[PDB]
Each structure stands twice: as structure tokens, then as C-alpha cells.
Symmetry: C2
Amino acid sequence: MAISPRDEQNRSVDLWFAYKVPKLTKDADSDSASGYEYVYYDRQVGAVQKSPNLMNDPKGALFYTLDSVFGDPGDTTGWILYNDEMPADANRSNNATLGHTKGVIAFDIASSSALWLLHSWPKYASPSVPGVPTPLYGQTFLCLSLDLATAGKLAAQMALHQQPQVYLPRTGGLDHTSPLYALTQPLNASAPGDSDSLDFKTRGGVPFKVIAKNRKWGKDFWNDLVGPTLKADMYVETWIRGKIPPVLDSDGVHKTYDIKFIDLRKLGAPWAWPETQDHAKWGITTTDNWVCVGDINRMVTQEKRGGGTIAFQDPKLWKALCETDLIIPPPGKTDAQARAMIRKTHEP
Amino acid sequence: MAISPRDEQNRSVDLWFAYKVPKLTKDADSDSASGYEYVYYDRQVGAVQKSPNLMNDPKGALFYTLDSVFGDPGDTTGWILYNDEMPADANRSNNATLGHTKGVIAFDIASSSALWLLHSWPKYASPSVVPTPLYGQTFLCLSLDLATAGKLAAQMALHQQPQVYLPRTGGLDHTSPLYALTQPLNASAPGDSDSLDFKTRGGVPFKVIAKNRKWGKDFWNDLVGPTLKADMYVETWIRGKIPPVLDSDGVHKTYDIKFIDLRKLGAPWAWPETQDHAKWGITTTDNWVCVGDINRMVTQEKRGGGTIAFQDPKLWKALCETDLIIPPPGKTDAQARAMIRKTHEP
């Protein structure tokens, strides 16, 4: 009854991760993937595996987690929802200056418990309308078990840097002095620095960092902030960070050759797809097993808006994500030539 | 020194059209096309053919036309520039409630002459100062008299509501509709669309068919087609996103399916329609060619914009024959065409 992430069988769990696949076409009558299939990971199952559920079913870690919050809240249960693209039932108009951060912070004062769900779905989530979010993209999800003090400290950072667009909150009787309450009130883009990083732990003791940029930041979020904060290089060499132009097949006909693919087949999830059909808001380091899941994608071109990423160390998840790389060269080209075309997208 | 479109040899011409190719690559070290190559058409040459020039050269119809305006203007020469994405030297934030329209109206009051250049480049043009080469684009440039340019300006003030920047009035009287286009656009438009008939100085009839920000229907099938009393040729248009499709190696990939192919016009390139601004269309009969501000996507913002429509059997046939359909692996031409039509769904 304390607020907690829920796993695939509705059991309380300290942390979970999911990678949802995009909608993928088999033929005119059927999809290979609807876009709600996913792989699931937590440290109890100990492996990244294909889920038997669809994410929009009323089953699986996402539903069980959010239903445990919204379904029958206590007198001191509350929540903060935010999204730069709010769902249709939101209680405010859009503010285009706020951060491109999306998520849910839920809490219960009496039990001193909280959770944080990070996702990248536009128009999600709603506390009373099961909205149908888009199936078209690969996406990642991270859900963490928190104590109330950690949720408050996180909300204080977000009020300063990420500056999320908060909608339909429930305060559960919070003191107006609480940073959780302050996050529901108007924000001031005032901080003099351009970034911030904080250390936290889950209730289970798993260390993580929240690494944020604000509207002043104009450099490379990944190589100039995240990497240096982790004291490790981001593994970027096969990232798509811009557009590859159409590539010649033959006789002057140029086609999309994606070159870089994300491949989950080693995890029992029988799908591989272009990185351009992926939100690509995760990254790993080349050493020390850091996994980052967050608000900011891999494109060199970015807006001057707040946002951040969660970083934590996980050898098992790091290995699984490392092994999702798939490089397919265009016709007549080598692997080295394909890698050079990918790296060219890193040029501004 | 009367204002006029200039052709590929820097001679005055009543009308010209250009189709610029996107940047196209062979590998990381070589490109098949820089994205400044183009085919050119006017009624004097009477053929749609690849230009010897690049559009960023200090020659060719685009350079010669704009240089005849910006290069050494007389005291009565002026211009209205507009773009929903203003260039950097405007030093102003964009107003997203104004129209998609991009272009240049230039004029000289002493000679009662004007020209209209329609283009689709963001952040362009600037009277003193590199536009993206990444997309296929169309251009149209028309010779107008000052009265016609003012009638067009009056329509724009109501419907397209273009975002004007760095104007030069050339001493325009403030009661001119051209001058009003440089002032804040506050007039309320009646209805959600408008269509007007015009002619070039050379007598070529054209229509300007415009929607305003209250329009929420299909610009092409519900406004343009009915205005022209013809059907738009849309059956192979990409009007939405096609998901990745399964290949035999077990991986899902981008298959473009619909390509734009200029090889029969001497330009040895074909490319995905998704790498094309696709702001042109033709009808199935009566030889209508439309070049404008509005692309083919079903999803549209509620903002102003329009298209220029005129009849030209020669350009119509050239554009019609640029279709190229390539099915995904294992699929037939019929299945490919059904996948394209699927992008037309609401």
C-alpha cells in the first residue's frame, strides 16, 4: 500500500525498465509489431526479456504501476504529471517555453513513499482517461522507488532546470512549503548555471544521478555534460545524430538506407528497426556500465529548453543495450563505409 | 530597368519555373547531387530541362532575378519579403500564427512594374546576405504590374497573412496595399478561403488559391480541385508516414515506395518523395500546374497559405511523368500503390 513501482505481476519492485518497439509492417493485412510490445527488465528477473503483455493492456508493469497510484488513492496520496505535449484532458493551455520532459511523480505522505516514472510518450499520462498514446516509435521507460525526501529534492531540481509543464496534479495535503507543491506553481527560468547534476538512491539503495540541462544550455548534452559528469565516454560512434541523405542504389535512383538499426532479437523480442523510428532517448557509456534513460535524444540539433536524463550503473542492462547495435551497409558498401556515413551525421 | 523575372541568360522573361533536386549521396566522401542542381522551364525555351547552373551560383535565373532587385535598386524600387521562418538578419522571433507563405514581391513605382518569386526555403531571402540544400523544391517567378501586385497584397493581408520582414518601401504611398502588407496584419477574413484570378504582364492567366487560419479541410481536394473544376492527381501522393517494412534478412527498414524521378528531363536523379517539399500538384485533366506554400500531408497546421495555379500542357506532362513506384521486397506494384494510398487516411 506504500507507493512503489509494480512489476509484470503487480508485485512491488525497486526499479524497472522497458523498451517498447515501434509499429512495424509485415504486409497489407498484418503488422509484425503493433507498437505496444516490449522487453522488460528489473533486478529480480535479472534478464532483459520479451514481455507477454502489450503496454496498453490493463496488465504489465506500466499499467500495474500507474493503476496502483491513480486507481484508489489515499487521503495523503498525490501526484505530479508533466509533459510538453499534454493529454487532451489537461487543465491548462500549452506553454511552448517549458522543458521537453515527460513523466509522473507519485507520493503518499502518510507512508513516506513515492515513485517516479520517466517516459517519452506525448499526451500521456492522464489520471482518469486511459489515453491511447502513439505506437509508432521505439521508446524507453524507467520507473524508480523513492522516499518522499528524494522526490522533494528531485522536484526542487526540476523547478530550477528541467522546468516541466505540470498538469492535473494532486497535492494530497502537501504543505505549500514542500518543493513538491512548488513544482505545481508558476516557474521562473532564472538559474545562472546552464546545467545541474544530483545523486540519489532508490529505496532499495540503488544509486542514480539526475543530470539536467536548462534553457541556457547550448552545447552537446551527451558529450559535454553527461559524459563528463559520469567520468566516462558516451558510446556515440554509431549514433544517428542527424539525417543521412538518400543514398544511390543504381541508375540514379536514390533511396533511404537507414544503415543503423536497433535489434532486440538476441533478447527474444523478434524485431529490429531503423534508429530513425526510435525516440532514441537512451544511451550507454563505453566503460563502467552506465545506462542513461531520459528526455533528450541523440540529435545534434536541439532546442533551448530544459530536460535531463537518469543515469545508473547496471552491468546486465548495459550489456543488453550494447548488443542491440545492428549496422547494415548500403549496397556495395563496406562496414567501415557505413560507419563513416553514420559518423557524418554528427557534424552540425 | 523595369522589374521582371530574369531567365537563365539574364534576359527579362514573363514567367519561369524551377525544380531543385535534394542533396543525394553515394557515400560519406562523394555526393551524386549537392542539392543545388535543378531543371528549368519557361515558355520561350519551351522545354523542361536540366540547368547547366547551380542555384547558389552567381548566375542562373534565381541569381539573375534577385540580383536585378537587390543589387542596385533605384530610389523607387522596393520589396516585401516574407517567410514563416525569418532569416537570422531579421533579428526577430517567429510568430507561429502567421501563414506558411514564403516569397518575395519586388516592385518599382516609377515604372509601375513588379515581380513575384515563390519559393519554399526557410530563412530566405535576405537582401544583403546559405539556404538548406537537403530537399527537392519548386520555384515560380511571375511578371506583374503594380496593380496586380497590390491586389495580391490585399489578398495576403486577409488570408495567407505572411510574416513580413526587412521590407523596403521605395517611397510607397501609405495607402497602397503593398505598404499595408508591411504593417501589422489585423484584418479579419470572411470565411476560411479565397481565390482570385490574375494575369502576368505577358497575359498568362493564373489563380492564387488561398486558405486562412480557420481552414481545417483538405486544401487540395476540398479547395484547389473544386476551384479549378478539376480533380487533383493525388492517387500516388505521400500524405502521411509509411511504417518500416520487413525485409528478408529479418530486419524492418524504410521503403520509400513513392519516388520523384527527373531522369526523363535530363536530370539523372530520382529520390524519395519524403525528401521533397512536395508543395506542387497537378490535375488529372485540363493541364493545371499548382506551385505553392502547402504540401501534400493530411496533417496540417491551422495557418494561412496558398498555391499558384496555371495551365501549361508542356510543364504538366513533364511533372506527370516524374512518378516512380518501387515496391518493398516481395510486394507487387499493386501492393505498393495500396501502401501509398494508406497514407491518405484521416
